[model samples]
Target: GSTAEPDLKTALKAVIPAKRELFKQVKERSDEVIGEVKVANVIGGMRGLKSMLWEGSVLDPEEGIRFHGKTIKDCQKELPKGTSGTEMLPEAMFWLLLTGQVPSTNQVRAFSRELAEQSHLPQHILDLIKSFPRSMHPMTQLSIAVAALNTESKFAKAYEKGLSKADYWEPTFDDSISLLAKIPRVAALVFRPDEVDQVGTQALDASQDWSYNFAELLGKGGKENQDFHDLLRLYLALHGDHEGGNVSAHATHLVGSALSDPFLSYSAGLLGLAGPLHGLAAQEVLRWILAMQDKIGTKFTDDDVRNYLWDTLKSGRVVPGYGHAVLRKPDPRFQALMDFAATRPDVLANPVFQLVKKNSEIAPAVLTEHGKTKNPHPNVDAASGVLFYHYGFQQPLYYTVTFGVSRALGPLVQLIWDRALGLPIERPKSINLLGLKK
Candidate 1:
């Protein structure tokens, strides 16, 4: 399609009522919070976040995510086959989760190649990454760097260039793909950014090793390179999608609802990721468990485990990785990952990590018996902590960062689709408790 003047006024007119109704309700909410409570207007109140506050996509608490009306396990059967692991191969799972279908290996290959093209970060973005102080938190650097990437917005540019709003998502889609491929390299490079030599000489490519490639740029090809390269592919593929409605994905959807540029929306989404209720819950879970291990040192007793765990609950703390906001049973993703880890030498090597697994499955049932758990099951967090420990990843913060890197795909695509379809800017209304019957 040619680049031509694209009008959104008509669409805007059609949407203004919904937006007004939204703002009316939002004003009610704002009034209750700000006027009644005496506070300032909060920006996020009417921001596009309501786009993601959907209720029950599947219309059942026990059953979530009915893609063409299929269950989670059913969807699993349709995604691609595993490459080398018993895990549902994150790539295949990604395709299934995103598109909701089983795909041939050839289809996955094409998708992988498409991803390969997106690997190079714009030099300007590279410069932006370099601009952050080395002492800055990696997430701080990440949030700023991601927001910076928006400077080259094709979607925003189209709005300026007179392209129709309906076409905005196409460029947004391209942006999502472009950034998705570069995330691993950006993360890896950001992990260690300093002079390689005393003279501030040249550096090595981090993408050279699967874990290392995460900290460096993608270098040219070779055999050992290919080995880690495959791992990188698997890592990205596996981590790419979780079920929608996660804080990261939902936050992205929320921001995209406001007609914010993809960069702005994604940046907003990343900021929302700090809370434990979101993707970072995995990191929080790990930290909590390891801290328990430290508190009960030298005693290898399972009784020690139960005693320590009881103290945590008595302190009014919810178990870090158990009782998901969703998922009544064990999270399928967590189960799949554990199944893969079970076959690895690393699983056997780390007995500490293994004991956590035993605690995880049993803790919930016991909790339920005591009326403490509405749902007691291990989540992806419980499993992820163990996997990272095996991988020599000692930092818990890195786990969430790793999750963000993986999930870069989901919300980005959803935002692109929203923009493409000319989905109206999400606006919701709020009401006051002034007329309470009570």
Candidate 2:
């Protein structure tokens, strides 16, 4: 157990530069669409549904959260009902979100045990994780580990041996289980060292409870062990999934089009999530607000915050906290998180978050009148970073890593189903301006 512990030097020495890659990904897009897929059942001539199962990411034309409705806010409301204790613990939310049904205290506790048992990081993985210079982004490290783990895949190896098409999903399911079990450890160990400006590299035990395990590596979440554990549960549950609508979800479906294995297809989604327009936007939102507050300095008027926000639009920045690639108004998820947060404004009073709220109320009308840069609305991401800020983290390198963990339940299950069900390869079409001249 002592051998498994992540050293401060290792975490600090990691030069993965997680934030740099994240910002760059937000700014870049692929030059070509490359994926391998199979032709399965074609649907309505409008779309061809692949029969090869995808174990990782699934694109639903419409997103529905299993335990909650389509949004995190819904999970907040629905998850509370599942707990025997009156408190809306994050871990409880995660359990409900993972399984569609509300879990009893016994059920939730059992599920927690299963996760700890399943998610242990292997010693080989620890060596591999350390082999990469801390200079790598944790997401990249995670992707590589999956690729590495692929070597050990009994399912892929067996499937290559001509397992029945209908049974492919069974192996996919197995990999999903293994992958989900290991992610918490993957995340827990990657805490950046004190001096490094990147993701950490701490090797945490998978056997510990989610809260205790995560807290040990990431540092205390304030208010003693009790509050921190509660935070862990909330973090895991609320961050699970939004509607299967963003780039991550879309890319998941697109890659799954080729009938690629879940590891590969899911990797494709991770690449999309790396983009700022999608999953990575949360940290940017926090930074954007903090910079504004610094630029604006003291006066502290709603009007001043509003004016500075308008200036961002007048100069041509997209107003990171203001608009969504989707959703028309302030995201319900933001409001829901704010509601939970409101109960502890004393602890939650990171000015950046407060500014985000102030701007959300004012920016929409201002943006609407400015007549440029889409609708002005506060999306969930705008406020969340502030909460993370209040919790004593600098901008997290892999903020959505927990999200990846939460989603393991649905996406992993789906991956197994796809393979076993004889789903075709996931392939989609794209155009390139070629120098095809003769």
Candidate 3:
């Protein structure tokens, strides 16, 4: 029998007492070391650091990410589907992350309505985003807009008015949902019209799912071809969490430790994600794949592909999307995305995706022979952009915005739990070069 989605707020309220008791127990048992950090852990950009605890999801190097112990495949089966029952709704995934249970369809619809009530942004926010120069990167504009949202933060306002420590999570929950509801509208403003931002209060069809509303907001997808909408559903599900240690998640967690509001905290994370080493890889993946397509043309064999891989390596460059800091196996996120492609022949037949498919097969073996990366497998970025390109979303700069929207699910969930559990500020020791040399 399918379990209905629990009322998230009510479920969380019931769980907090037990979790607080556990926190009390952990404090008394203080002699245990959870993880040991060597000098290499510090020097290698804290590669294996385990200092922070994020509860919503964890990345297992061998098995990939599990959200609250459910695999992505498990989620596909368990999460509430929209009317079509073809894909999981974003709100349903969020509800699971929020309450640790797959929501029923009625619960999902109610939750969607809650999000919709908070979806529209204030005119000032739209004006502020519009104030940015046309040449500014969308990510930069997004960060600014998010920071501006700090003005409306329910948490910040409540903290100013004073609240009990035990009740802090309550306002944090309010602010978190407020930001989540408003981000799509804020982000959509970047591509949408100033007039739409100013006066267009478009109402979504009640029948369409949340991500479809998002796709429709972005001016993509169709009733005839639901591929783009379906892709977004998959993207949100798979990219929801990748453990807590990644740069963006860590930054968000770290910033939130200072008791910053959700908007400010998530904005800080977006800045970190803007780095080339992080979320920007999706754009780079398409760039490199397109370059390969031009260089190899249609007549290339697997060996020719191998030679290009070798040549790229010899030139002291990485094959973007091919290696991961974690995951010895091929990224389940990548494989899940591939599963989406398999569902659509046109997606599979895309020239760039065909190249990505072939490269996924060849690149791992070539990288293994070269012997540089431990995980010589395609990561999520490998095929992320190809899906967007297939859906007619060609603007490279906007890719991270899509990622930012999906990524909010995990870190914000972590943030809410962090407050609920009464976790303290995160402060790590630093070392100078002289201390290292000595």
Best by TM-score: 3
- Candidates in order have lDDT scores of 0.57, 0.56, 0.82
| 180-298 per-residue lDDT for model 3 (tens digits) | 87777777777664545533356666556778777777876467657777888888777777878888898999999999989999999888888889888898888888899899997
- Candidate 1, superposed: residue stretches over 4 Å from native: 1-60, 63-78, 81-94, 195-244, 369-372, 435-438
Rank the models by TM-score, top first. Answer: 3, 1, 2
lDDT of candidate 1 over 1-438, digit per residue (tens): 854222222223344356446556765675353223212223334322222433112323464334335554664556544333222344454444444345566555555555545555566766666677756766666667777777767776777778766467567766676676566666655554663121112233422222233423423235433333333444454455444466676677777787677777877777767565776787787787777777887555777777777777788787777775555665655565566556566565676676677677567765776677666777667777666656556765766666767667656756754664456766656555553322
Candidate with more favorable, higher TM-score: 1 or 3: 3
Worst 10-residue lDDT window, candidate 1? 195-204
Candidate 2, 190-257: lDDT as tens digits: 54434122223344444345555556556663346455455556655555555344556556656654
Model 1, residue 78: distance off in Å is 4.6
Rank the models by lDDT, top first. 3, 1, 2
> What TM-score does model 2 achieve against the real structure?
0.73
By lDDT, is 1 or 2 better? 1
Kindly report which residue stretches of model 2 are placed more than 4 angstroms away from their true locations once superposed. 1-74, 80-100, 193-212, 221-225, 253-260, 395-400, 407-410, 431-438
Point out the worst 10-residue segment of candidate 3 by lDDT. 192-201
In model 3, how large is the Cα lDDT of residue 278?
A: 89
